[PDB]
Design brief:
The chain contains ten helices and eight strands. The chain is of the alpha/beta class and 275 residues long. It has a single domain, classed as NAD(P)-binding Rossmann-like Domain (Rossmann fold). Strands 3-2-1-4-5-6-7-8 form an eight-stranded mixed β-sheet, with helices on both faces. α3 packs parallel to α4. The longest helix has 23 residues. It is globular, with a radius of gyration of 18 Å. The structure holds NADP nicotinamide-adenine-dinucleotide phosphate and chloride ion. NADP nicotinamide-adenine-dinucleotide phosphate (NAP) binds next to α1 and α4. It catalyses: a secondary alcohol + NADP(+) = a ketone + NADPH + H(+); a primary alcohol + NADP(+) = an aldehyde + NADPH + H(+); prostaglandin F2alpha + NADP(+) = prostaglandin E2 + NADPH + H(+); prostaglandin E1 + NADP(+) = 15-oxoprostaglandin E1 + NADPH + H(+). Belongs to the short-chain dehydrogenases/reductases (SDR) family. It is an enzyme of class 1 (oxidoreductase). This is Carbonyl reductase [NADPH] 1.
Length: 275
Amino acid sequence: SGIHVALVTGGNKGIGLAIVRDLCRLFSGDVVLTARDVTRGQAAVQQLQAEGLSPRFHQLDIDDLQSIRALRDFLRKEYGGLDVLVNNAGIAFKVADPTPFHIQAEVTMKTNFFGTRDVCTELLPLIKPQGRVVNVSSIMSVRALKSCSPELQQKFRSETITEEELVGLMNKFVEDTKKGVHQKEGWPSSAYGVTKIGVTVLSRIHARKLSEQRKGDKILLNACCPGWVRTDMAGPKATKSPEEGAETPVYLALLPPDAEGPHGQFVSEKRVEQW
Ligand SMILES: NC(=O)c1ccc[n+]([C@@H]2O[C@H](COP(=O)([O-])OP(=O)(O)OC[C@H]3O[C@@H](n4cnc5c(N)ncnc54)[C@H](OP(=O)(O)O)[C@@H]3O)[C@@H](O)[C@H]2O)c1
Ligand SMILES: [Cl-]
């Protein structure tokens, strides 16, 4: 015991796998690969074992609170909590999918925003002093933000938005798309980008909370943009490999002890971007 733990959601493929890999290399202590599918998770653990690395495995579907809570119990029992969390897991419908737009909004939101949020609700209390939390968002959240009404821009830029208020903006977007009024209600047209506005802004909220509640515990929490990366979510035409895409999340997960930041930032290519 006293052994440090890092954990990645969505770890069986894509950028998440790559993050697990570099944490296995760079992080002192245990690295937990999580996957909603067991057999996908284990296959990828076997992948990493063939490269000479030793991740641990736990099941996790961020869409299931009982899965998240089982994961929470395991971390308390095995480690007394958590040093590093990376919220990597997410989904995007491709644009030509004929699924009704309101269903794409709702489904994407449920995982990207609401699943991420539940994991932070359950796991943040376990985060240990000198810990790091990394929420993988997207540069598309910036593009979605600027396509919002100025009135929605100001809410989402606010230094004092509360988690409850963000929850209701996220729900509003979904509800508006269903009633066929989101354009008029000032929303942008990317359901996905809106969920990452979700993630980007939760991060800012959560960072403030940690300094309100846990000043001195030297905990750093940030959103990031991994770049355009070649994974099941984008395509073979994307610019970065999964490995290149892991870079900024890994950087934010291993920020040295007692570093003063970045904290509550939106980080792309290891630099702080404007929100
Ligand atoms: N260009 C890009 O690729 C790009 C750009 C910007 C941001 N990002 C962000 O990068 C993060 C990872 O995406 P990726 O590009 O590596 O895509 P990916 O290849 O589709 O992998 C996504 C990972 O998330 C997991 N996931 C989806 N829903 C889940 C759920 N309910 N519970 C647990 N895991 C779930 C997936 O598991 P399954 O194998 O079971 O689906 C998979 O392991 C996502 O947040 C994405 O938004 C990606
Ligand atoms: Cl990005």
